[PDB]
C-alpha cells in the first residue's frame, strides 16, 4: 500500500498536456467496481446471518409390549434426551485517513470522494477474505465470548468429532473434508470421491440438493474432457461424461449412444455454469486458487442454510461499517477512521469438501486464505 498524511506536494493540478486532475479523480469518485461486486456476490451466496439454535436433537428410544398374565404386572419403561450447540468467531478491524490543513484547502473534492469509495471497496475485500479462510483454513480456532472460551470449526478436519450416522452408515473419529488428489492433474475418481464424501452425510440429489463445484480454469479444462469409459489423468476411467451447459460453444455429440448426464441450464444463482459431471454443476470461479476445488451442497431438505455463519456485534449501534470522527482535527492535522467488526464459523461441517490437486503429502492452506496472513 501507500500511507501517511496527505500533504501539499501530493496535489497535482494539471497534466503536462493541461488536463485537470480533478476530472481524472472524478472517474473514481462514484463508480462501483465489477470485481468487488463479484466478491460481494460470493459472500452473499456463501454466508448466512448467525442465529442461535441447537444442533439436531438425537431421537429417543422406542418401547415394546410384554405378554400379559392374570396374576402378575408388567415391567416398566423409560427414555432420556441430550442436545448440543456450536459457536462463531468475532474480531475488530479499522483503517485511517490522515491529512494536513494545506491538503484539505488545496486538493480537489473528487480525491476525497475517491478515498471514501476506496474504503467501501477495502471492506468488501476484507469480508470476502474472512469468509473464504473460514472454509479453506483447515484449523480449529478458539474464541472468547462473554469471557468464556469456545471452539469454532472448519469442515471435518481429522479431529475427534464423529459425524452423525445416516441411513445406517456410521463414521469414525478422524473424518476429513480437506482431501489430497494423489496426482498432478485432477481425474474423475477424485471428483467422484469428493462428491461422495459430501453425499455420505445426506445432501443427496434424492433429498433435493444440488452440488456445485467452484474451480480454476486449469482444472475445469481437465474435467470437461471426461467421457464415459475413457481413461483420464492418473489412469482413472470416467463413470459419467461431462455435459456442457446450454450456453457454451457448440460441440458434436460423439456417438449415437448419447451423453450420460442431463444438460445444465445457463446459470446457477446468477453465476454462469460450464457444465456437469456426475450430477454436480461446475462453475469457472476467478477467485479460486489454481490447485484447488471447492465442492458445496445447496438446497433440498438439509442445505437450506448457506455454509458460513456471519456474526456481527450484538448491538445495532456497532453493526455495519462505521466512520469514527478521529482525534486530530481542523488545524494543523486532520484524522478520521473507518471501523468494522464481525467474525465467522461453520455449522454444517460436512456440507462442503475442499480438494487439493498435488501428487503426495498433506493438505496445504491456500496462502491468500491462511488465517493470520493479511486483510487484502
Amino acid at each position: 500500500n501507500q500511507g501517511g498524511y496527505n500533504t501539499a506536494g501530493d496535489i497535482k493540478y494539471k497534466t503536462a498536456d493541461g488536463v485537470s486532475y480533478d476530472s481524472l479523480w472524478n472517474l473514481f469518485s462514484n463508480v462501483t467496481d465489477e470485481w468487488n461486486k463479484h466478491k460481494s456476490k460470493m459472500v452473499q451466496l456463501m454466508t448466512f446471518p448467525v442465529t442461535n439454535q441447537t444442533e439436531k436433537v438425537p431421537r429417543i428410544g422406542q418401547f415394546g409390549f410384554e405378554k400379559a398374565s392374570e396374576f402378575g404386572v408388567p415391567e416398566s419403561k423409560r427414555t432420556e434426551l441430550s442436545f448440543y450447540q456450536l459457536a462463531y468467531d468475532f474480531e475488530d478491524y479499522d483503517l485511517a485517513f490522515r491529512y494536513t490543513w494545506k491538503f484539505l484547502r488545496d486538493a480537489p473534492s473528487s480525491q476525497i470522494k475517491a478515498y471514501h469509495n476506496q474504503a467501501l471497496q477495502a471492506d468488501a475485500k476484507l469480508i470476502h477474505r474472512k469468509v473464504m479462510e473460514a472454509i479453506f483454513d483447515n484449523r480449529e480456532r478458539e474464541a472468547d465470548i462473554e469471557g468464556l472460551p469456545y471452539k469454532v470449526y472448519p469442515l471435518y478436519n481429522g479431529d475427534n468429532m464423529i459425524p452423525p450416522e445416516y441411513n445406517g452408515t456410521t463414521f469414525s473419529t478422524g473424518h476429513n473434508h480437506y482431501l489430497v488428489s494423489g496426482g498432478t492433474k485432477i481425474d474423475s475418481a477424485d471428483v467422484e470421491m469428493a462428491a461422495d464424501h459430501i453425499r455420505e452425510h445426506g445432501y443427496t440429489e434424492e433429498n433435493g440438493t444440488q452440488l456445485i463445484a467452484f474451480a480454476h480454469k486449469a482444472e475445469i479444462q481437465e474435467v470437461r474432457r471426461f467421457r464415459f469409459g475413457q481413461t483420464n489423468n492418473n489412469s482413472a476411467v470416467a463413470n459419467y461424461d461431462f455435459v456442457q451447459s446450454q450456453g457454451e460453444s457448440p460441440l458434436y455429440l460423439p456417438n449415437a449412444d448419447g451423453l450420460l448426464g442431463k444438460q445444465p441450464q445457463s446459470m446457477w444463482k446468477g453465476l454462469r455454469v460450464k457444465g456437469s459431471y456426475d450430477d454436480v454443476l461446475w462453475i469457472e470461479e476467478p477467485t479460486m486458487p489454481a490447485g484447488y476445488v471447492l465442492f458445496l451442497a445447496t438446497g433440498g431438505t438439509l442445505a437450506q442454510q448457506n455454509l458460513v455463519g456471519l456474526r456481527e456485534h450484538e448491538d445495532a449501534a456497532w453493526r455495519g461499517l462505521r466512520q469514527i470522527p478521529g482525534n486530530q482535527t481542523r488545524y494543523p492535522l486532520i484524522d478520521s477512521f473507518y471501523q468494522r467488526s464481525f467474525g465467522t464459523g461453520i455449522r454444517q461441517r460436512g456440507g462442503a469438501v475442499v480438494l487439493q490437486i498435488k501428487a503426495s503429502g498433506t493438505y496445504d492452506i491456500p496462502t491468500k486464505w491462511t488465517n493470520g496472513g493479511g486483510f487484502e
Binding site: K56, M161, G261
Partner: protein, 53 residues
C-alpha cells in the same frame, strides 16, 4: 391394433439413472421429519458453555 410397443431410446443427452426404492423413500420422508428436531437458544450469551462442542 398391433401388439408391439416401440421402446424408448437414448437421446443426445440422457439423465443419470438412479434406482427408486420404497426403503429409500421411507428414509427420505423420515429425514424431512428429523429436520424439525431443533430449538432456538440464547446462544453463547448465558454465562455457561457446557452444551457447546
Amino acid at each position: 391394433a398391433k401388439g408391439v410397443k416401440k421402446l424408448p431410446k437414448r437421446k443426445g443427452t440422457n439423465p443419470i439413472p438412479r434406482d427408486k426404492w420404497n426403503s429409500d423413500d421411507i428414509a427420505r420422508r423420515q429425514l424431512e421429519q428429523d429436520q424439525k428436531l431443533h430449538l432456538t437458544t440464547k446462544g453463547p450469551h448465558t454465562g455457561t458453555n457446557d452444551s457447546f462442542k
